[PDB]
Amino acid sequence: NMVPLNPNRIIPDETSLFLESILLHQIIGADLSTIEILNRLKLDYITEFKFKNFVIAKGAPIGKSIVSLLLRCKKTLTLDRFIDTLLEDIAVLIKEISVHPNESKLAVPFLVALMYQIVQFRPSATHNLALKDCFLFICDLIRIYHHVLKVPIHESNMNLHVEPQIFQYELIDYLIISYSFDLLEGILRVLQSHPKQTYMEFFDENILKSFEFVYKLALTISYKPMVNVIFSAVEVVNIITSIILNMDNSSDLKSLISGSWWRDCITRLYALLEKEIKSGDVYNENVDTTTLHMSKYHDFFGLIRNIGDNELGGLISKLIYTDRLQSVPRVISKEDIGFTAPIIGYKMEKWLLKLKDEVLNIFENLLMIYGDDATIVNGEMLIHSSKFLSREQALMIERYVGQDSPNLDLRCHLIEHTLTIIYRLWKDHFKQLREEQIKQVESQLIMSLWRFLVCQTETVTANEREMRDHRHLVDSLHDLTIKDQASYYEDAFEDLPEYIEEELKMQLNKRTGRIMQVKYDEKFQEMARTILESKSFDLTTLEEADSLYISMGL
Amino acid sequence: NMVPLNPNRIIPDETSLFLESILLHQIIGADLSTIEILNRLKLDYITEFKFKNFVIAKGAPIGKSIVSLLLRCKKTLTLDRFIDTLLEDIAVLIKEISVHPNESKLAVPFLVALMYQIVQFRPSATHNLALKDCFLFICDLIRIYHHVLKVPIHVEPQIFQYELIDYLIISYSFDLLEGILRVLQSHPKQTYMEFFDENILKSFEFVYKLALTISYKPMVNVIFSAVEVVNIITSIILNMDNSSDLKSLISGSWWRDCITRLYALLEKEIKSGDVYNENVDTTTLHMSKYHDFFGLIRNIGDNELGGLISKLIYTDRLQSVPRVISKEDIGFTAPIIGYKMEKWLLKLKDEVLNIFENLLMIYGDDATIVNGEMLIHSSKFLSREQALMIERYVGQDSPNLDLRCHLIEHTLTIIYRLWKDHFKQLREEQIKQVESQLIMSLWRFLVCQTETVTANEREMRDHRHLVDSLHDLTIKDQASYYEDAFEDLPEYIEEELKMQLNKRTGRIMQVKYDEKFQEMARTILESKSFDLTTLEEADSLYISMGL
Incomplete structure (x- = not known):
């Protein structure tokens, strides 16, 4: 009944499989591995970045440098260390080309996507400190991009939707936001399947407050939000609640999360549930946010989920020149994106339906987080x-x-x-x-x-x-x-x-x-x-x- | 007492560490992950390429497809089949750019450098069939570049057009022959004979005839590469216990046609004071301003063109044609490089007389050689x-x-x-x-x-x-x-x-x-x-x- 030791195992080096799944990593609809999309980008308003040997020189494709980083810290770290180190490094990059308001920040979306492929390539060993780092990080980035998440509900007279029809940077901002919200979901997942003996760490008032600002920027009750970010924020709320239950010593951290703070979650989440779904015009500027639309003007899948047509993923198949070291990238266009296949609207609505399943089940999860309850x-x-x-x-x-x-x-x-x-x-x-x-x-x-x-x-x-x-x-x-x-x-x-x-x-x-x-x-x-x-x-x-x-x- | 054990023996995979070495491929002075080097190689003319899935187009970098392969080929292929697949695919690249005189060949030098990281990666892992084929594909690339096959001895006035392209790739390709046959040498003493094919040995006889160019100024990086290739053949000879079979394959004509130019080598002079000087040729080993650097093993000394290898790929712009590697922007402080070059050509003369004394050992009895x-x-x-x-x-x-x-x-x-x-x-x-x-x-x-x-x-x-x-x-x-x-x-x-x-x-x-x-x-x-x-x-x- 022996189950033999195989004296010549061939057991993968999962950091190596990771190095691969990075260098090849391609977003849904891209011409290149999105890493290589990085790999054809030099930027002239960051002459020279470093955090720990990450020189994006004055003549570096942000790719060139990031792939080189993959190689360096591949030689350096072990798997958990490498996850942490790409988190810290790629992040501080995302900042220094995000809080620098005059440069081509299109590295940033796929950098966030790289956060994603990292954290969800090895959510096994990813660890609380860098978790919170990237979490809060792109949170402050979303406070950086206040403009798009909070654009007037209908552009009231004075404000005009005379935008350069640009999912170009619309992609930049929205992509970063949704990708990073999916990264927040995956961080919650590393802790969500992480042992609940150790749940007092990735929860802090800073997590909560950053999410306050970003959640409120996305679920813009006063302005015209977009449905990828609405999905993503409410998903973050959802997993947050999931762990509010799945934390064993629950009273302490339920004291930590403010009652008024769940309340400001659920005012906007009731707002959601009372917002509705107008398929015939879901790909058209509709009524004041009471019509979840995910307009073709801001339209791709997302990462643990594919709600749109991702038509603009095709225009990511025209995101960079793909034949040129672009300084600023190839247009993605809000107008070009979107009688053909209303199955598009139907699958996206099957999502919004499953979204409201999420909403009902996490309202339900709130119902469980308190047996004796409070203002929420x-x-x-x-x-x-x-x-x-x-x-x-x-x-x-x-x-x-x-x-x-x-x-x-x-x-x-x-x-x-x-x-x-x-x-x-x-x-x-x-x-x-x-x-x-x-x-x-x-x-x-x-x-x-x-x-x-x-x-x-x-x-x-x-x-x-x-x-x-x-x-x-x-x-x-x-x-x-x-x-x-x-x-x-x-x-x-x-x-x-x-x-x-x-x-x-x-x-x-x-x-x-x-x-x-x-x-x-x-x-x-x-x-x-x-x-x-x-x-x-x-x-x-x-x-x-x-x-x-x-x-x-x- | 007893030897202890491990709960979580975490062995990086052989192909894992393979991609380590491969992705961070680097050659002295080629400051980069040479995979990235490759990533800086676009080829407009050729908009159609595909051997074992090798998509390439106008502004589509050789390296973009190189990374493509490396990555998914890791999970597809095994260790040695990965080797072979790189050899043959990037060899089809070697060719179709080599037989594409209209384009420039910045590909082939670092492609071949990749070929070397491959080749070196292990002796035992690397398989002689793949090694066999690699040399044959290099010979096909040399036939495709018939115009620039050898270095014909004044259109050449400090102008590195094909000197930093085809000729640089020639030194690289020659160092590749060298290390190819060196890993063949390291292959165990039992399983050479499949390598011993007169296809192999005739193609080498020709490439040697092109390298030790008695009638045209023979580039000394190339001279070193070729004489080292001969050393590798004679060593695999001393090694294959059934040496009668290999000696049967190596024609007495092969012996003679090689050792005679080895004489013409061993009797070219070693003169530090003029090593890096294109003066009295067919004696002084020039390799001066015209062309000096490492290649794929050679630590030729300064590796003057070394940092220029990095300066070959823009490393700051997408380039269809090579970034100028200057020919005499080169180095020079004090001839310790000439002293080490004397020692280097002296190790070349040593290799010559070494295989000489080594054939005097094995062929102890009567021998036409x-x-x-x-x-x-x-x-x-x-x-x-x-x-x-x-x-x-x-x-x-x-x-x-x-x-x-x-x-x-x-x-x-x-x-x-x-x-x-x-x-x-x-x-x-x-x-x-x-x-x-x-x-x-x-x-x-x-x-x-x-x-x-x-x-x-x-x-x-x-x-x-x-x-x-x-x-x-x-x-x-x-x-x-x-x-x-x-x-x-x-x-x-x-x-x-x-x-x-x-x-x-x-x-x-x-x-x-x-x-x-x-x-x-x-x-x-x-x-x-x-x-x-x-x-x-x-x-x-x-x-x-x-x-």
Whole structure:
């Protein structure tokens, strides 16, 4: 039963694999490895930089120097040390060509991207000090680029959108921001999977405050934000909360994070959830931020996620001359970027949908961070939460079913889950909710519960006769998915073994029922019922709960 | 007691450290990661390139595709297959730029430098098939550059057009042949024969015929490269136990057609005072303003063009054509470079007579290559350099005195083994044609038998203070820097130092030679394998020391 030592192992040098995954590293749509995009850039307003042998001479491609750095500190460090050292060095570079307001700072985006490829090449050994370094670092960089993150909601008269149609530097700023927010996500991840015996370090008031300023610059309630940064900021909020739970000695750091500071998170995050999605004009200047757009004028994927078309990634395939040592880079253009494939809008909206899954689940995570709570959840996480829950009931009904699009099932699963969030709030966090706010939203609460309730008996099919017709009229997308998973996307789900389609006929059927407002899992239905029929609090008037229920029975 | 273990044995991969060396490739003076060097090589004319996935276009740098390969080729290929893939792909590059006379070839020099980091990376790892092919592809590139194949001996007036391009790549490519065959040498003594292909040896015979250019001024970096290639062949010969097979492949015509130009080499002069001077050619080893630098192993001395190798790639601009490497913007403070060049060409002459004495060893029996013409020229070398040393290289206070001593003593070994056993080639033609050289090679070590020269400690120390001052300052550099127990000595180490130095400078003086060497020039006369001197002539030399 020996498992033999292989006396001639060939075990990789992961720092070497890293050196590779750097020198080859290419952003989505680029002509070059983005490292080489660096490697064709000399800049004339930094004659000579050094931090620790990183001379970007007066005649150096910022690449030339950065790749050379990869080589030097490759010879120097071991893996964790090299992660830390590229962090520090590439950062202090990002500063010295970011706080230098007259030079071509297009190294900076891919430098941040390099932060990303670093931290998320070896999030195993990356460590708190340089984590916070790059974190706070590009945070202050985003405070450097106050202009784009805070551009007037509609350019009020005086302010004009007469911009040089320039995703050129628009890319520079936006790219840095989103890439670095994804780097914040990955830093949270190194600590997020890091042992929770050691969670008192990468949390500090400086993390919080830098994020204050940058979060507020991105979720610009007064100006016209962009959806990559909105995604990214709310994702950072999300992982922040994830660790607010996954920190064991939680009371101390929950004291450290200010209650008013989560509050200033969630004012803007409720603001988000109440901002909406106008696909037909998502690639056009729409209404005052109540229309998440990610306009083609500022449009690429992002790093742990690909929401746009990344059309402007193609113009990164014209980002530099690719035949010239450019001093300032090749245009990317806001006008050129963006009847062709509204699947573009559909996948991006499937994101924004998953975004609001993130939002609901991290609102939910807040719900857990406090069992006994404070100003962030003061019945407001019933007000705004159930307001979203009922807004999505009303939208799914009034349009989205029949609108019968890719969104349907994902949205219905996640808003029934936000129903469940309402449920556990109204049961365990039932302690907080006081009269003033249960009166501000008695409406939403009671009738959202009532809507889900008018279903359980379901005398229609209770089977797969023509509720499968419904599975075709709306769940046709998930029918394409059952086809695709059985024919393309499962090693075993070809030649079904006859104990699974017996289940399919009803399971996918109640999936499309949850799409079409009915036949939610008995779990779901009694969740919704018990939220309302909890007579322990007179949410319902006992003499009229009969008039309520008699829409179904009871 | 027991040897201990390790929880996390963290071995960098062989290819990991490979990319280390490769990416940070650098050549003395080429100040860069030579991969980056390559990154500064765009080629407009050729907008179409692809061997094993080698995309290249107008403003698309050779190096951009070099990094491309290096990187994904690490995860694709293994150690030696990585080597081979680089060899063949970057060799297709070598070619299609070489056969592309319209473009300039700044690629091939550092491409070949990359080829060397490859080649050197390991002997055992590197595989002889790949090594085989690399040399063949270099020969194809030389055929593509037929116009600039050799250095034809006044359009050339301080203008480094193709001199810093094709000719620079020629020195690089020649140093590549050299190190290629050196890693072949290092390959174990069992598995040469696949390398031994008359394709290989004929192509080399041609490139040697182009390097030791007797009729056109032969660039000395190239001369060194070629003679070292010959040394490598003769060494792989001494090594392949089944040497009969390799010797069957190497034609007697190959032997002759090479060793004859090696004679024409060993009898070109070594003259420091004019080494870096293009004056009397076919004698003085020029390599002056025209062209001097390292190549791929050579530490030619200053490496004057070294920093210019970096100055070949802009390292500040994308260049389609080479950044000017100035030909005589070059260096010059004091001829310690000429002194080390004397020592360098003296190690070249050493390599020549070394493979000579080495073929005299293996071909101990009758040999069409142990013809005694060997006797003639090699004994000429012996007596000639003996004369030069005792007549001019005395008082000269050089380190090169030691190396001329090496020359004479080693050619003594050669002609002596010729004397002792291998007269089966010899006839009276060579006997009387060179009897003076042999017999006086004999007496020069005979007369040393006095042993009353030193006999003491007050005189040879001063003799070295006189002439050996150089190697004395070097034994002091030794006592100070280059060894370990030069402190609180056991009273034998310093004594050995002084005996060795004293006998050493004596050996510079052609007196008090190693008594083994005294006998190993006595026995040729006194042992009657050949009675050079009759009884009416032997005493005529016996008188010159007493006897």
